[PDB]
Design a protein around this nucleic acid. Structure first.
Ligand SMILES: CCC[C@H]1[C@H](O)[C@@H](N)[C@@H](O[C@H]2[C@H](O[C@@H]3O[C@H](CO)[C@@H](O[C@H]4O[C@@H](CN)[C@@H](O)[C@H](O)[C@H]4N)[C@H]3O)[C@@H](O)[C@H](N)C[C@@H]2N)O[C@@H]1CO
Ligand SMILES: CCC[C@H]1[C@H](O)[C@@H](N)[C@@H](O[C@H]2[C@H](O[C@@H]3O[C@H](CO)[C@@H](O[C@H]4O[C@@H](CN)[C@@H](O)[C@H](O)[C@H]4N)[C@H]3O)[C@@H](O)[C@H](N)C[C@@H]2N)O[C@@H]1CO
Ligand SMILES: [Mg+2]
Ligand SMILES: [Mg+2]
Ligand SMILES: [Mg+2]
Ligand SMILES: [Mg+2]
Ligand SMILES: [Mg+2]
Ligand SMILES: [Mg+2]
Ligand SMILES: [Mg+2]
Ligand SMILES: [Mg+2]
Ligand SMILES: [Mg+2]
Ligand SMILES: [Mg+2]
Ligand SMILES: [Mg+2]
Ligand SMILES: [Mg+2]
Ligand SMILES: [Mg+2]
Ligand SMILES: [Mg+2]
Ligand SMILES: [Mg+2]
Ligand SMILES: [Mg+2]
Ligand SMILES: [Mg+2]
Ligand SMILES: [Mg+2]
Ligand SMILES: [Mg+2]
Ligand SMILES: [Mg+2]
Ligand SMILES: [Mg+2]
Ligand SMILES: [Mg+2]
Ligand SMILES: [Mg+2]
Ligand SMILES: [Mg+2]
Ligand SMILES: [Mg+2]
Ligand SMILES: [Mg+2]
Ligand SMILES: [Mg+2]
Ligand SMILES: [Mg+2]
Ligand SMILES: [Mg+2]
Ligand SMILES: [Mg+2]
Ligand SMILES: [Mg+2]
Ligand SMILES: [Mg+2]
Ligand SMILES: [Mg+2]
Ligand SMILES: [Mg+2]
Ligand SMILES: [Mg+2]
Ligand SMILES: [Mg+2]
Ligand SMILES: [Mg+2]
Ligand SMILES: [Mg+2]
Ligand SMILES: [Mg+2]
Ligand SMILES: [Mg+2]
Ligand SMILES: [Mg+2]
Ligand SMILES: [Mg+2]
Ligand SMILES: [Mg+2]
Ligand SMILES: [Mg+2]
Ligand SMILES: [Mg+2]
Ligand SMILES: [Mg+2]
Ligand SMILES: [Mg+2]
Ligand SMILES: [Mg+2]
Ligand SMILES: [Mg+2]
Ligand SMILES: [Mg+2]
Ligand SMILES: [Mg+2]
Ligand SMILES: [Mg+2]
Ligand SMILES: [Mg+2]
Ligand SMILES: [Mg+2]
Ligand SMILES: [Mg+2]
Ligand SMILES: [Mg+2]
Ligand SMILES: [Mg+2]
Ligand SMILES: [Mg+2]
Ligand SMILES: [Mg+2]
Ligand SMILES: [Mg+2]
Ligand SMILES: [Mg+2]
Ligand SMILES: [Mg+2]
Ligand SMILES: [Mg+2]
Ligand SMILES: [Mg+2]
Ligand SMILES: [Mg+2]
Ligand SMILES: [Mg+2]
Ligand SMILES: [Mg+2]
Ligand SMILES: [Mg+2]
Ligand SMILES: [Mg+2]
Ligand SMILES: [Mg+2]
Ligand SMILES: [Mg+2]
Ligand SMILES: [Mg+2]
Ligand SMILES: [Mg+2]
Ligand SMILES: [Mg+2]
Ligand SMILES: [Mg+2]
Ligand SMILES: [Mg+2]
Ligand SMILES: [Mg+2]
Ligand SMILES: [Mg+2]
Ligand SMILES: [Mg+2]
Ligand SMILES: [Mg+2]
Ligand SMILES: [Mg+2]
Ligand SMILES: [Mg+2]
Ligand SMILES: [Mg+2]
Ligand SMILES: [Mg+2]
Ligand SMILES: [Mg+2]
Ligand SMILES: [Mg+2]
Ligand SMILES: [Mg+2]
Ligand SMILES: [Mg+2]
Ligand SMILES: [Mg+2]
Ligand SMILES: [Mg+2]
Ligand SMILES: [Mg+2]
Ligand SMILES: [Mg+2]
Ligand SMILES: [Mg+2]
Ligand SMILES: [Mg+2]
Ligand SMILES: [Mg+2]
Ligand SMILES: [Mg+2]
Ligand SMILES: [Mg+2]
Ligand SMILES: [Mg+2]
Ligand SMILES: [Mg+2]
Ligand SMILES: [Mg+2]
Ligand SMILES: [Mg+2]
Ligand SMILES: [Mg+2]
Ligand SMILES: [Mg+2]
Ligand SMILES: [Mg+2]
Ligand SMILES: [Mg+2]
Ligand SMILES: [Mg+2]
Ligand SMILES: [Mg+2]
Ligand SMILES: [Mg+2]
Ligand SMILES: [Mg+2]
Ligand SMILES: [Mg+2]
Ligand SMILES: [Mg+2]
Ligand SMILES: [Mg+2]
Ligand SMILES: [Mg+2]
Ligand SMILES: [Mg+2]
Ligand SMILES: [Mg+2]
Ligand SMILES: [Mg+2]
Ligand SMILES: [Mg+2]
Ligand SMILES: [Mg+2]
Ligand SMILES: [Mg+2]
Ligand SMILES: [Mg+2]
Ligand SMILES: [Mg+2]
Ligand SMILES: [Mg+2]
Ligand SMILES: [Mg+2]
Ligand SMILES: [Mg+2]
Ligand SMILES: [Mg+2]
Ligand SMILES: [Mg+2]
Ligand SMILES: [Mg+2]
Ligand SMILES: [Mg+2]
Ligand SMILES: [Mg+2]
Ligand SMILES: [Mg+2]
Ligand SMILES: [Mg+2]
Ligand SMILES: [Mg+2]
Ligand SMILES: [Mg+2]
Ligand SMILES: [Mg+2]
Ligand SMILES: [Mg+2]
Ligand SMILES: [Mg+2]
Ligand SMILES: [Mg+2]
Ligand SMILES: [Mg+2]
Ligand SMILES: [Mg+2]
Ligand SMILES: [Mg+2]
Ligand SMILES: [Mg+2]
Ligand SMILES: [Mg+2]
Ligand SMILES: [Mg+2]
Ligand SMILES: [Mg+2]
Ligand SMILES: [Mg+2]
Ligand SMILES: [Mg+2]
Ligand SMILES: [Mg+2]
Ligand SMILES: [Mg+2]
Ligand SMILES: [Mg+2]
Ligand SMILES: [Mg+2]
Ligand SMILES: [Mg+2]
Ligand SMILES: [Mg+2]
Ligand SMILES: [Mg+2]
Ligand SMILES: [Mg+2]
Ligand SMILES: [Mg+2]
Ligand SMILES: [Mg+2]
Ligand SMILES: [Mg+2]
Ligand SMILES: [Mg+2]
Ligand SMILES: [Mg+2]
Ligand SMILES: [Mg+2]
Ligand SMILES: [Mg+2]
Ligand SMILES: [Mg+2]
Ligand SMILES: [Mg+2]
Ligand SMILES: [Mg+2]
Ligand SMILES: [Mg+2]
Ligand SMILES: [Mg+2]
Ligand SMILES: [Mg+2]
Ligand SMILES: [Mg+2]
Ligand SMILES: [Mg+2]
Ligand SMILES: [Mg+2]
Ligand SMILES: [Mg+2]
Ligand SMILES: [Mg+2]
Ligand SMILES: [Mg+2]
Ligand SMILES: [Mg+2]
Ligand SMILES: [Mg+2]
Ligand SMILES: [Mg+2]
Ligand SMILES: [Mg+2]
Ligand SMILES: [Mg+2]
Ligand SMILES: [Mg+2]
Ligand SMILES: [Mg+2]
Ligand SMILES: [Mg+2]
Ligand SMILES: [Mg+2]
Ligand SMILES: [Mg+2]
Ligand SMILES: [Mg+2]
Ligand SMILES: [Mg+2]
Ligand SMILES: [Mg+2]
Ligand SMILES: [Mg+2]
Ligand SMILES: [Mg+2]
Ligand SMILES: [Mg+2]
Ligand SMILES: [Mg+2]
Ligand SMILES: [Mg+2]
Ligand SMILES: [Mg+2]
Ligand SMILES: [Mg+2]
Ligand SMILES: [Mg+2]
Ligand SMILES: [Mg+2]
Ligand SMILES: [Mg+2]
Ligand SMILES: [Mg+2]
Ligand SMILES: [Mg+2]
Ligand SMILES: [Mg+2]
Ligand SMILES: [Mg+2]
Ligand SMILES: [Mg+2]
Ligand SMILES: [Mg+2]
Ligand SMILES: [Mg+2]
Ligand SMILES: [Mg+2]
Ligand SMILES: [Mg+2]
Ligand SMILES: [Mg+2]
Ligand SMILES: [Mg+2]
Ligand SMILES: [Mg+2]
Ligand SMILES: [Mg+2]
Ligand SMILES: [Mg+2]
Ligand SMILES: [Mg+2]
Ligand SMILES: [Mg+2]
Ligand SMILES: [Mg+2]
Ligand SMILES: [Mg+2]
Ligand SMILES: [Mg+2]
Ligand SMILES: [Mg+2]
Ligand SMILES: [Mg+2]
Ligand SMILES: [Mg+2]
Ligand SMILES: [Mg+2]
Ligand SMILES: [Mg+2]
Ligand SMILES: [Mg+2]
Ligand SMILES: [Mg+2]
Ligand SMILES: [Mg+2]
Ligand SMILES: [Mg+2]
Ligand SMILES: [Mg+2]
Ligand SMILES: [Mg+2]
Ligand SMILES: [Mg+2]
Ligand SMILES: [Mg+2]
Ligand SMILES: [Mg+2]
Ligand SMILES: [Mg+2]
Ligand SMILES: [Mg+2]
Ligand SMILES: [Mg+2]
Ligand SMILES: [Mg+2]
Ligand SMILES: [Mg+2]
Ligand SMILES: [Mg+2]
Ligand SMILES: [Mg+2]
Ligand SMILES: [Mg+2]
Ligand SMILES: [Mg+2]
Lengths: 275, 48
RNA sequence: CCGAGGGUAGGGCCCGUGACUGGGGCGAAGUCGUAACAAGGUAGCUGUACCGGAAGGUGCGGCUGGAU
RNA sequence: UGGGAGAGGGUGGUGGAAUUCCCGGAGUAGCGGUGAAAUGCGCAGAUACCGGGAGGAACGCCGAUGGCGAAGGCAGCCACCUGGUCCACCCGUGACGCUGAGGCGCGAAAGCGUGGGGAGCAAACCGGAUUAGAUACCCGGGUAGUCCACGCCCUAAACG
RNA sequence: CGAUGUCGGCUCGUCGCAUCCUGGGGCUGAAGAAGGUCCCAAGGGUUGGGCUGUUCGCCCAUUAAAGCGGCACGCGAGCUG
RNA sequence: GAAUGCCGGCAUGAGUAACGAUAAAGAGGGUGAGAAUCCCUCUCGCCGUAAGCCCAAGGGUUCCUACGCAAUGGUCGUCAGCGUAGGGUUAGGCGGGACCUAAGGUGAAGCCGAAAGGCGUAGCCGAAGGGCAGCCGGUUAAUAUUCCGGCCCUUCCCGCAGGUGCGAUGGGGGGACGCUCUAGGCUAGGGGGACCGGAGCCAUGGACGAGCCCGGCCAGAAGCGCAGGGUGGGAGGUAGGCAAAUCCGCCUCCCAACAAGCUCUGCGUGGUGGGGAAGCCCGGGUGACAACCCCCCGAAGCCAGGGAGCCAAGAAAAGCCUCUAAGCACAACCUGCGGGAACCCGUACCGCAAACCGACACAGGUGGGCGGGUGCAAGAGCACUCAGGCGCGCGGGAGAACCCUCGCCAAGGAACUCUGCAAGUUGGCCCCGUAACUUCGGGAGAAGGGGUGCUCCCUGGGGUGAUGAGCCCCGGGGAGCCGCAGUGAACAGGCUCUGGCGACUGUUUACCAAAAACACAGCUCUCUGCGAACUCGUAAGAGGAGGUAUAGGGAGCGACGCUUGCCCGGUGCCGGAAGGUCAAGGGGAGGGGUGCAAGCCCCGAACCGAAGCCCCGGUGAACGGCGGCCGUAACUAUAACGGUCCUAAGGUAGCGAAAUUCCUUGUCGGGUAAGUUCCGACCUGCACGAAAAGCGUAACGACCGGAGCGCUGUCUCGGCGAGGGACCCGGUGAAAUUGAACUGGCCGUGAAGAUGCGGCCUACCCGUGGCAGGACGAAAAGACCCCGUGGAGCUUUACUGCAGCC
RNA sequence: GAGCUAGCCCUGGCCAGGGUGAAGCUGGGGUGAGACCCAGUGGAGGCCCGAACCGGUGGGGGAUGCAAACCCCUCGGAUGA
């Protein structure tokens, strides 16, 4: 896990790469890939609305199955585990015993050639999906719908998970990957097990070039700009921020909470995030 | 060095052409004004 | 051909020396405190960590070479 | 060969007590702390009481002058994996032994790297005291760390 | 202010004399030698370097001496920058 | 009569600068009124990874021929891309369209917006991407994969025969894919031949030779041959591929498996069709029944959708194949053969340039392919040269100063200078050898040296072929020869020690700054639970993201190492259901106006009443801040120590005369003969200091310092030489500027710096080459400065408002 | 008005030749098994020389220019941001 390199270039001594040892197939299922339109951070008006984006490697988008309740009771074999460049997690190729082929994000521990299934009567096993109400209290879980039949929304990234803390009426209590305590409907589906590829955070990009490969263009500090461009612009020589540190758009960027106060989901957020 | 005029027939007709003008209000008012001024030609000549 | 050596170039070892800087030994009666020897007035010693004008203090574990 | 004792080690799981916190209830004028106090906490409803929930660390009684380990060291309980040792029978090998410069491995605490974890405790730091002073002992706070995994550190009143 | 280019250097000189040297002098607390001071005198001469943008200044090695000033702090339609 | 007025005309500078790469010219013979300039020949130089050839843009008759020379052409002109006229561009296969999709554009549906309009699924458009059928040669003054010749092929229609469950905008397969490295076999291309064909040639001392010179092929249908690519067979089940499905997917079983078979390409051969040199003679004729053979090298191209590895994970749709739906099975589809049908547009010429973009026939700019040979290690580098193309559209002289580009230099050798600026030196390859330090890779081309040609002899292996010869590729040893010198010409690091800044590769002020600046991996803080936060938009809608806290936004800091202390009093931000203030609204004690009165109408206290602010806490890798005075030790000196005032707290580690130090060239040491710079120290740090990070740091740097070595024209201190200019002659012929000018020096005066006034001195009239002191020379209505109640960018706890948010 | 310039999207193209020799793989040594070491193979890299190409460091020229940014000598990078 995490391959290092000898320092034979300046950049190599810090660059690290994934071990890729869990991957078993190196080309995607043609039936489940579709072209991925690179935006470069521009919208239908043409304007950059997310700065510092563009120019990374071309990608194909693997269609992933965030529902899984559309095939209740139909077991599937884990055919392969594959690379997905659209996400931090690895994906698992499923061959359903009724013929259909799908991708799911690969939980940790999932091995090729094993049965998985979804439904209220499913066993509590790494890779199975159930409504949250049918999962024992205290089990880690991932790919969690935030509302019934609306799609898996929570605990998607590599290594993430969500622990079930308790039950209350139609609602179970989840500890999200951020540490927030939240109520999620018991009818929402979830997949027992944490998402795999936990060493994804120990990867060291080693040089600027790798960031460019990922479609990340160089970020330029407000302190480097001019007053026309940024609150931190200007100064003779260097200059401390000389005001509360602000975004390019004036609003303060140290501690200022921005969650909408009257947002209706607040009635279901038990505790804001930790740390 | 590389100068500002780099002719390109597709570009010329797609940018200043008759069909480009008629598509927007400002383009139609150009044509109205040029037609009123008596301009022999309302749009750049590009041989296509 | 070899050849004393001369020469150019780059290494190794040792000795002397250097603005300044580090502590050390030693030197009857200078200054600050009082850490240790009595339970030495916070039992002491301890490896380490961090701190403090200075002896020292404190955490963590260890020893009795600790009184009662 | 057949037995026996044991906190010997490693892995996964797990059980209750207590502390802190959070939510609900009930209740009101103080609580806390000391040699005595103050800082601090409390009518913005604390402390004391009940129910609930979260989380970490440590395992009371048994417990001992006890047991095991080469040493460091090892204590809730369950299971897996594994080390050492003792005894009986007197069956096998037939001196195959003792030690051990180098080597290699192990090695309390503290400390270090990358992640995680964080209740309690607590270097540093802050405050209240004491005091001539108090960079201390006492008190209220309190961050590393204390905990887990992996990788280094290799020291000790590592002592009989 | 419908523009008189601003330091220093380089190059090229030219002038003044309140003279650094060389020539002539008087006084000397001028024995000699060598000095001090003042007078006359502008003919000629008045070095090579280290440092600094430097002018100046300090220092090295010399020297008969290593003079002081003016010429838009001489000289950028001559150069340097 | 003046407006740096406006329009025009004509002057001045002036026969002046220049006439656009220094690749280069000369003579003869032509034509003509006229010739350095046009034509022809011979000689000379120049490009030759082009300065040659073929495409694509863009240009649009500039192409060909005839007739011209007014203007255009930097001179000339008989010439021309100029003027006039006539001619010239031929395709089912090349390119595009009647085929397909990409971004994007458009857009029935739907959504949104005062209007105009903005979105938007399908669908439509959109190509240098996918798909699709022509190759060799001949012919014209000018077109040719287009005309013609030879050999091939595609689609549509109809027919005939055979076969089959046929049938699609519907399902599926396929199309269909990255980067780096890469195998086998070929081909393009090239090298060689003592073999084959050829008009000849023997010089000038030798050669009648295994002599010189020239050439030795291109295309090709079926078949065959070599080399590859693609591809399991069959059956049973089947809930999935939005109806069906015999297909596809999933499952089971049987047999084949590195073959084979089928299928498709490439290369070879291939019936036949072409081509065919030098030389000689007038583009052609001959050569010539031309020959058309062997060997070697060999692609980056072909087989290809091959193989391997790697992470950053690598379009779509149609053609095509298959499956079935309605339907239809007299049909329809497939297969084979035959006849018939096959439209629109481009096609000239230029295309690294005199035809494109730069006002010019402009030393600049412009995408793709081919780009021969020899040698130098290789190569597209460099020198020469082939095919081919040019001698750059002013020339002839002269042989000054001076300028440019270049060569050399006695002795010295950085003494030059802000600075070794510049120019030397070094320089490729092989081998020997190589330091501190280091993150263990590096530093390293360290530094420093040796070798390098040619001949003869002996020999090792490789490729091809066959194992041999031959060619060809890497070497090894020994003896020699020559020169001043052997990468003999061309192309080809000067080196070292020590600081500063930044880790680094990168990036930037197009046109004065390439850096220490920006970026950067990495660290931290912070926001964000997803209809996310944030961004653009009135909105719809997008982006974020078809992502989900190991994620996405914002901010500082900026690899790595060791680290980042104290202050929450002020500002920000975060938390706080109490309290205080607080708007509309609720409330209506209590008044008022009016009317005869019911009534109508107006004012209006208490009290209830958000956010915000007050208030209570928190918070620094939030904005920020991190003291003063006096005294004291048994010599002096200095204060471990104490006293006191203030604060929210009084700067911790580490650094320090520094990219920071005013006094300052601080002081001491080092280096030097001498050192305001440099390096090392010290510490009264005017005014370092810890993520506007602090102290280090190997490696890196066209960054900025200091030193040394090497070597020099930088210098003492200049000299000579070359060429292109300057100069003279012929041709063409500008420019800024210009009140008019008959335009001297001194000392004065004058608005204070006089050719122009005074006095004096000096001076015959006009040029040409030179130098720049003056004409307060030219240029720009000073860019500094002030002034204007002139303007603009920027800031903020200036005013006021608006978005946004509450 | 993005036919210049800037960023992004889509689809194509280009980058001679020569150096260095990462991981892995193999064999060998080592050990209880390991780590590990040696050789070979291998061919990594915002690696090195150097064109084409992209630039524009220093100097000189040019300055009514060949050119409203050029010429010469030199120089940065050149499988990648
Ligand atoms: C004439 C010389 C007299 C001297 C004495 O000989 C010295 N020993 C010294 O004496 C000091 C003495 O100074 C100590 O004596 C030692 C120097 O000589 C040193 O103390 C240290 O001694 C070390 C051993 N040489 C260690 O034990 C440790 O570092 C100290 N204890 C000094 O700090 C001090 O402690 C006493 N309070 C006062 C006393 N007069 O200084 C004196 C000067 O006046
Ligand atoms: C004369 C020759 C010169 O001496 C050569 N230096 C070369 O000079 C060219 C020059 O060629 C470049 O100059 C270098 C030749 O060695 C190379 O550029 C590289 O130089 C490197 C430093 N030696 C680096 O700066 C970088 O790799 C390139 N800039 C060449 O591509 C070209 O760019 C100029 N426009 C025109 C110039 N005459 O070619 C000239 C003849 O063709
Ligand atoms: Mg690494
Ligand atoms: Mg390493
Ligand atoms: Mg993996
Ligand atoms: Mg698809
Ligand atoms: Mg997208
Ligand atoms: Mg759009
Ligand atoms: Mg943005
Ligand atoms: Mg962007
Ligand atoms: Mg993801
Ligand atoms: Mg993945
Ligand atoms: Mg829910
Ligand atoms: Mg990381
Ligand atoms: Mg990417
Ligand atoms: Mg980043
Ligand atoms: Mg940045
Ligand atoms: Mg700035
Ligand atoms: Mg700026
Ligand atoms: Mg702007
Ligand atoms: Mg602003
Ligand atoms: Mg600012
Ligand atoms: Mg600034
Ligand atoms: Mg500043
Ligand atoms: Mg700045
Ligand atoms: Mg400030
Ligand atoms: Mg602000
Ligand atoms: Mg906001
Ligand atoms: Mg939360
Ligand atoms: Mg340009
Ligand atoms: Mg263009
Ligand atoms: Mg076009
Ligand atoms: Mg266009
Ligand atoms: Mg148009
Ligand atoms: Mg017109
Ligand atoms: Mg008309
Ligand atoms: Mg128009
Ligand atoms: Mg000798
Ligand atoms: Mg005393
Ligand atoms: Mg004494
Ligand atoms: Mg003690
Ligand atoms: Mg004591
Ligand atoms: Mg005491
Ligand atoms: Mg004590
Ligand atoms: Mg302490
Ligand atoms: Mg109270
Ligand atoms: Mg907890
Ligand atoms: Mg026996
Ligand atoms: Mg703790
Ligand atoms: Mg106190
Ligand atoms: Mg240990
Ligand atoms: Mg003025
Ligand atoms: Mg004027
Ligand atoms: Mg002027
Ligand atoms: Mg005397
Ligand atoms: Mg006298
Ligand atoms: Mg004189
Ligand atoms: Mg001075
Ligand atoms: Mg003077
Ligand atoms: Mg002046
Ligand atoms: Mg003056
Ligand atoms: Mg002055
Ligand atoms: Mg000048
Ligand atoms: Mg000057
Ligand atoms: Mg002048
Ligand atoms: Mg001059
Ligand atoms: Mg008048
Ligand atoms: Mg006039
Ligand atoms: Mg006017
Ligand atoms: Mg006018
Ligand atoms: Mg006019
Ligand atoms: Mg006029
Ligand atoms: Mg007229
Ligand atoms: Mg005229
Ligand atoms: Mg006249
Ligand atoms: Mg004239
Ligand atoms: Mg003349
Ligand atoms: Mg003249
Ligand atoms: Mg001229
Ligand atoms: Mg000219
Ligand atoms: Mg000219
Ligand atoms: Mg030239
Ligand atoms: Mg030349
Ligand atoms: Mg001749
Ligand atoms: Mg001639
Ligand atoms: Mg004639
Ligand atoms: Mg002529
Ligand atoms: Mg003539
Ligand atoms: Mg001719
Ligand atoms: Mg002749
Ligand atoms: Mg050639
Ligand atoms: Mg085009
Ligand atoms: Mg034209
Ligand atoms: Mg004419
Ligand atoms: Mg004429
Ligand atoms: Mg004529
Ligand atoms: Mg005529
Ligand atoms: Mg003309
Ligand atoms: Mg011309
Ligand atoms: Mg044809
Ligand atoms: Mg038709
Ligand atoms: Mg309209
Ligand atoms: Mg189309
Ligand atoms: Mg096409
Ligand atoms: Mg075609
Ligand atoms: Mg053909
Ligand atoms: Mg069918
Ligand atoms: Mg179809
Ligand atoms: Mg594909
Ligand atoms: Mg694909
Ligand atoms: Mg393709
Ligand atoms: Mg890649
Ligand atoms: Mg061929
Ligand atoms: Mg060859
Ligand atoms: Mg079925
Ligand atoms: Mg014949
Ligand atoms: Mg190629
Ligand atoms: Mg291919
Ligand atoms: Mg492949
Ligand atoms: Mg599509
Ligand atoms: Mg029928
Ligand atoms: Mg069929
Ligand atoms: Mg038609
Ligand atoms: Mg044609
Ligand atoms: Mg060119
Ligand atoms: Mg031409
Ligand atoms: Mg133009
Ligand atoms: Mg121009
Ligand atoms: Mg010309
Ligand atoms: Mg050839
Ligand atoms: Mg070579
Ligand atoms: Mg060349
Ligand atoms: Mg010429
Ligand atoms: Mg002459
Ligand atoms: Mg000579
Ligand atoms: Mg010389
Ligand atoms: Mg020297
Ligand atoms: Mg020398
Ligand atoms: Mg020097
Ligand atoms: Mg000089
Ligand atoms: Mg050379
Ligand atoms: Mg060394
Ligand atoms: Mg070394
Ligand atoms: Mg170093
Ligand atoms: Mg090393
Ligand atoms: Mg060397
Ligand atoms: Mg030799
Ligand atoms: Mg020779
Ligand atoms: Mg070099
Ligand atoms: Mg060095
Ligand atoms: Mg920088
Ligand atoms: Mg840099
Ligand atoms: Mg730095
Ligand atoms: Mg660094
Ligand atoms: Mg950095
Ligand atoms: Mg680079
Ligand atoms: Mg610039
Ligand atoms: Mg500029
Ligand atoms: Mg500009
Ligand atoms: Mg420049
Ligand atoms: Mg640079
Ligand atoms: Mg920048
Ligand atoms: Mg950096
Ligand atoms: Mg860092
Ligand atoms: Mg963090
Ligand atoms: Mg907005
Ligand atoms: Mg999306
Ligand atoms: Mg920064
Ligand atoms: Mg270090
Ligand atoms: Mg504060
Ligand atoms: Mg506070
Ligand atoms: Mg505060
Ligand atoms: Mg209350
Ligand atoms: Mg309020
Ligand atoms: Mg402030
Ligand atoms: Mg403050
Ligand atoms: Mg500290
Ligand atoms: Mg200092
Ligand atoms: Mg100083
Ligand atoms: Mg100094
Ligand atoms: Mg410093
Ligand atoms: Mg300072
Ligand atoms: Mg100074
Ligand atoms: Mg000094
Ligand atoms: Mg001092
Ligand atoms: Mg700051
Ligand atoms: Mg700061
Ligand atoms: Mg650099
Ligand atoms: Mg640089
Ligand atoms: Mg030097
Ligand atoms: Mg000279
Ligand atoms: Mg000459
Ligand atoms: Mg004459
Ligand atoms: Mg003459
Ligand atoms: Mg004339
Ligand atoms: Mg003329
Ligand atoms: Mg007049
Ligand atoms: Mg007159
Ligand atoms: Mg006169
Ligand atoms: Mg006056
Ligand atoms: Mg006067
Ligand atoms: Mg006069
Ligand atoms: Mg007058
Ligand atoms: Mg008068
Ligand atoms: Mg007069
Ligand atoms: Mg006179
Ligand atoms: Mg004349
Ligand atoms: Mg003249
Ligand atoms: Mg003059
Ligand atoms: Mg003048
Ligand atoms: Mg004037
Ligand atoms: Mg004037
Ligand atoms: Mg003048
Ligand atoms: Mg003047
Ligand atoms: Mg001007
Ligand atoms: Mg004006
Ligand atoms: Mg004005
Ligand atoms: Mg003015
Ligand atoms: Mg002006
Ligand atoms: Mg002023
Ligand atoms: Mg005013
Ligand atoms: Mg006024
Ligand atoms: Mg104003
Ligand atoms: Mg404006
Ligand atoms: Mg304004
Ligand atoms: Mg408004
Ligand atoms: Mg453009
Ligand atoms: Mg491409
Ligand atoms: Mg390349
Ligand atoms: Mg190797
Ligand atoms: Mg391998
Ligand atoms: Mg590279
Ligand atoms: Mg190299
Ligand atoms: Mg390089
Ligand atoms: Mg230079
Ligand atoms: Mg000039
Ligand atoms: Mg210029
Ligand atoms: Mg140039
Ligand atoms: Mg060059
Ligand atoms: Mg390359």
């Amino acid at each position: 896990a995490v391959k290092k390199f000898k320092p034979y270039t300046p950049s190599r001594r810090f660059m690290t790469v994934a071990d890729f040892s869990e991957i078993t197939k190196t080309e995607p299922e043609k039936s489940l890939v579709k072209p991925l339109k690179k935006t470069g951070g521009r919208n239908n008006q043409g304007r950059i609305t997310v700065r510092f984006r563009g120019g990374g490697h071309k990608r194909l988008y693997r269609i992933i199955d965030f529902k899984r309740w559309d095939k209740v009771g139909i077991p599937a074999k884990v055919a392969a585990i594959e690379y997905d460049p659209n996400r931090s997690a690895r994906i698992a190729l499923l061959h359903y015993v009724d013929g259909e082929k799908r991708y799911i994000i690969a939980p940790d521990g999932l091995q090729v050639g094993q049965q998985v299934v979804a439904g209220p009567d499913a066993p509590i096993q790494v890779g199975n999906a159930l409504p949250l109400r049918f999962i024992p209290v205290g089990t880690v879980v991932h790919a969690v719908e935030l509302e019934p039949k609306k799609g898996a929304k929570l605990a998607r990234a590599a290594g993430t998970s969500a622990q079930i803390q308790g039950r209350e009426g139609d609602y179970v209590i989840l500890r999200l990957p951020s540490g927030e305590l939240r109520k999620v409907h018991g009818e929402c589906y979830a997949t027992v097990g944490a998402v795999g590829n936990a060493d994804h955070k120990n990867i060291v990009l080693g040089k600027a070039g790798r960031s460019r490969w990922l479609g990340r263009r160089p970020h330029v500090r407000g302190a480097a700009m001019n007053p026309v461009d940024h609150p931190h612009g200007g100064g003779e020589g260097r200059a401390p921020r000389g005001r509360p540190p602000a975004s390019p758009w004036g609003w303060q960027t140290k501690g200022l909470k921005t969650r909408k106060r009257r947002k209706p989901s607040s009635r279901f957020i038990i505790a804001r995030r930790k740390k | 060095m590389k100068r500002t005029w780099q002719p390109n027939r597709r570009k010329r007709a797609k940018t200043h052409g008759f069909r480009a003008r008629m598509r927007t209000p400002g383009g139609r008012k150009v044509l109205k004004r040029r037609r009123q001024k008596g301009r022999w030609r309302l749009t750049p000549a590009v041989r296509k």
